Write a protein that binds this ligand. Structure first.
Ligand code: HEM
Ligand code: HEM
Ligand SMILES: Cc1cc(N)nc(C[C@@H]2CNC[C@@H]2OCC/C=C/c2cccc(F)c2)c1
Ligand SMILES: Cc1cc(N)nc(C[C@@H]2CNC[C@@H]2OCC/C=C/c2cccc(F)c2)c1
Ligand SMILES: C[C@H](O)[C@H](O)[C@H]1CNc2nc(N)[nH]c(=O)c2N1
Ligand SMILES: C[C@H](O)[C@H](O)[C@H]1CNc2nc(N)[nH]c(=O)c2N1
Ligand SMILES: [Zn+2]
Lengths: 411, 407
């Protein structure tokens, strides 16, 4: 069956057939759409079909489907599963797997870059000190003195689910938030709980507005251990505005490297519960969300005051005005310091090109519209007007519950 | 089977049960989500009739009363005999209000119960349609102080005797195919503007020409009517700070009035039910003024503000978009024509969502339409999970009449 998507700005009509390879479920039914819901141990029995599915995909892509090497590899995996109960990915399969998880990430506007992904193989890792080193190296390689390169580091897969590798941080680099006795927060409000855990675990907190949190790392199902990224490995950008000279005295800065560490990479049935990955920012992730959610730094008031906007009625659009100025300041700063960043206009445009190309070359591109359209100026970006189809392909990145909810404490 | 919705800004969790009475299909499956697609006999009539009357009598606290069973019988009898039935005034008023209450794509539903309903079921001709519509326009406009209303022409019969209002809105500007190659007026309306010309309209060929109504009665060929100019309240667009804004020659109309939808109540189909409320600012300033395929004035505005249009990263589009929208609100306010801004309106839908969760057990909402087309994440609806499902009575899209009318 063929499914058509229309762009209402251009009238371009695309045809999806790739949704026919979709496996996992969406959360939706014929009676309810759960399209705006944020969140809508594996036996031999289920594992070989998944391995087989993945390996048929790998071997088609390299143009060897049906070859001896393909059959022999099916055979080899088959055996390994029924004798040790799991199996090991080859280097080529792991690289391919991790690229495709990104390619299949329907909530990711940056996918035009999916084939340029430096894969770091950390499957020989055994301790939390080992993980630290691996993560320091990724951070240095990815940062690259401001010329950001996309990368992922992949630690040993799940075994019995009692011996998991996890990164407890939700991003490798993030600012502490501290809830004060008066009910206010210093630093990033989103990170308060993580920051209490670290403090509990022994971290001595400076207690400023921008403290880079320590990594909290779990190897082999063991209790997590604290480590401090070397500051010289943490590129930061002070934020200033091209026209407004008072902007800088707001005291704002941000880190250059966005690096998601709390997700689970599934490849061919295997579960990599520690796979920190990193790319580069779209400006609005900082200027819209990080600075301007009420539940984050919430600097909109202070910025509108200083621009002397009429603040006594929402209808002056003072919030909208302040938000655009802040975002200007974020792109200006990153650009001035030569730290890679992309604006939301250029990023949505690249995506639509990527999306069309994926339809022509792959029969589709699963895309989640709620996530792809930027969180300011939606309708003046070309994705707003693009119909999309959302579906789940493997390999894939998945959410997992935070580890402090599920960890069996040892000693 | 009971479903939770979380607000990520407040942590407020609401529990939806209303979806279990969801009747129609969404377009999604367990394999594919279609959340972002624009358009995803006697034997069926009685169930539909029954389901509706059941909710009506429940609403008036008379579920399973003599009056209730008596009516179910009376309707059951009318259908068996006539193949259709007629709604009581009270049923029709309740049905229209609930079609709006159930509009998953409408941010303005806090207002659903203040809807003045005009029963035009006795209408027989286009001239009659025209009279009813002018009365609707004048009543709803109310010299700038807008009031919600719907006018309801006679229901579908054998489907070759449909009443349709061919315009997509009661009041829209003309769009013209030009020798130049570009587009004069509103490009949304080009086709329809040509159908009017082609039935005899005398286009004045300007940027802002109020289109003539094309009305169809009892499946007849449609006719033209010029809404009296003095009933069309228009607003000149100026900026509270930029003196030059005026010189762009921008105006919009005060009355948003959708006329191309099909209202379905208890299985009955009202193919002509133009309805109107009042504008959210962004509807004119973001979409009407700034869409590529619309008036598309951002470049012209950015220029007058002397912004750096060399690179997209100066955010020149975004800056101009805010100002264009500031001017829309300011103008409507200055001329005292009701408008709501997107902050105020989404904050209202949130309180209305809460009320519906506690009073009705839920609220179908299409997040993709609810979240404004500018500044999404700074409005509270950005962070609010929503469930989308189809309840009846409802408004539905229908084929544009010309594609269908046997001429
Ligand atoms: C090249 C630079 C990249 C850019 C500009 C980019 C852009 C984005 C943005 C703006 C989001 C949504 C964040 C939000 O608004 O909450 C996102 C989500 C995501 N991206 Fe990327 N991305 C990039 C690289 C990558 C990489 C390297 C990966 C992993 C290989 C990745 C995988 C994902 C995933 C899994 C999500 C969903 C996150 C979640 O569900 O919490 N992206 N992308
Ligand atoms: C009272 C002020 C009202 C406000 C502020 C309002 C707001 C809106 C907005 C902003 C949209 C999205 C429009 C778009 O972006 O295309 C919309 C859609 C809609 N509203 Fe309202 N509304 C109002 C009154 C009404 C009334 C009186 C009705 C019916 C009685 C109604 C029913 C609908 C329907 C069916 C849609 C979806 C139309 C479509 O799918 O194209 N609304 N509303
Ligand atoms: C590699 C990468 C590049 C890039 N530009 N952006 C991303 C993803 C972004 C980066 N900053 C945070 C975001 O990750 C998701 C954060 C929130 C998501 C979330 C999802 C589910 C539940 C929840 F609580 C939160 C990743
Ligand atoms: C009553 C009302 C008030 C209000 N503020 N807004 C609305 C709905 C708005 C009025 N202007 C645009 C929108 O009407 C329908 C928009 C287009 C929808 C559409 C649906 C299917 C196909 C298509 F081409 C277009 C209705
Ligand atoms: C493709 C997508 O479904 C389409 O562009 C939608 C997106 N959201 C919208 N939201 C509103 N309010 N109005 C619209 O016309 C649309 N168009
Ligand atoms: C409720 C809703 O699904 C949720 O708040 C989403 C909306 N869109 C988003 N879009 C992006 N890019 N990132 C997000 O975190 C969210 N949050
Ligand atoms: Zn869906």
């Amino acid at each position: 069956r063929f499914l058509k998507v229309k762009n209402w700005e251009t009238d371009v009509v695309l045809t999806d057939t790739l949704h026919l390879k979709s496996t996992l479920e969406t959360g939706c039914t014929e009676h309810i759409c759960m399209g705006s819901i944020m969140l809508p141990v594996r036996t031999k029995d289920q594992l070989f079909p998944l391995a087989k599915e993945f390996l048929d995909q790998y071997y088609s892509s390299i143009k060897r489907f049906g070859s001896k090497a393909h059959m022999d590899r099916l055979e080899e995996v088959n055996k390994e599963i029924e004798s040790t109960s799991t199996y090991q990915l080859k280097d080529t399969e792991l690289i391919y797997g991790a690229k495709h998880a990104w390619r299949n990430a329907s909530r990711c506007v940056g996918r035009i870059q999916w084939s340029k992904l430096q894969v770091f193989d950390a499957r020989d890792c055994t301790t939390a000190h080992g993980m630290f080193n691996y993560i320091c190296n990724h951070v240095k390689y990815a940062t690259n003195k401001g010329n950001l390169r996309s990368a992922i580091t992949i630690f040993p897969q799940r075994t019995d689910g009692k011996h998991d590798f996890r990164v407890w941080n939700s991003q490798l680099i993030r600012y502490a938030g501290y809830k004060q006795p008066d009910g206010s927060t210093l630093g990033d409000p989103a990170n308060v709980q993580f920051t209490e855990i670290c403090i509990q675990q022994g971290w001595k907190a400076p207690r400023g507005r921008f403290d880079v949190l320590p990594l909290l790392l779990q190897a082999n199902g063991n209790d997590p251990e604290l480590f401090q990224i070397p500051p010289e490995l943490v590129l930061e950008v002070p934020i200033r505005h091209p026209k407004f000279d008072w902007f800088k005295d707001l005291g704002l800065k941000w880190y250059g490297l966005p690096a998601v560490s709390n997700m689970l990479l599934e490849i061919g049935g295997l579960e990599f519960s520690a796979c920190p990955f990193s790319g580069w920012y779209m400006g609005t992730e900082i200027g819209v969300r990080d600075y301007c959610d009420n539940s984050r730094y919430n600097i909109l008031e202070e910025v509108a005051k200083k621009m002397d906007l009429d603040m006594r009625k929402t209808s002056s659009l003072w919030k909208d005005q302040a938000l655009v100025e802040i975002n200007i300041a974020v792109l200006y700063s990153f650009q001035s310091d030569k730290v890679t960043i992309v604006d939301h206009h250029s990023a949505t445009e690249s995506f639509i090109k990527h999306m069309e190309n994926e339809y022509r070359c792959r029969g589709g591109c699963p895309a989640d519209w709620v996530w792809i359209v930027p969180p300011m100026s939606g309708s003046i970006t070309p994705v707003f007007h693009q119909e999309m189809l959302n579906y789940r392909l493997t390999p894939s990145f998945e959410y997992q519950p935070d580890p402090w909810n599920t960890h069996v404490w040892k000693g």
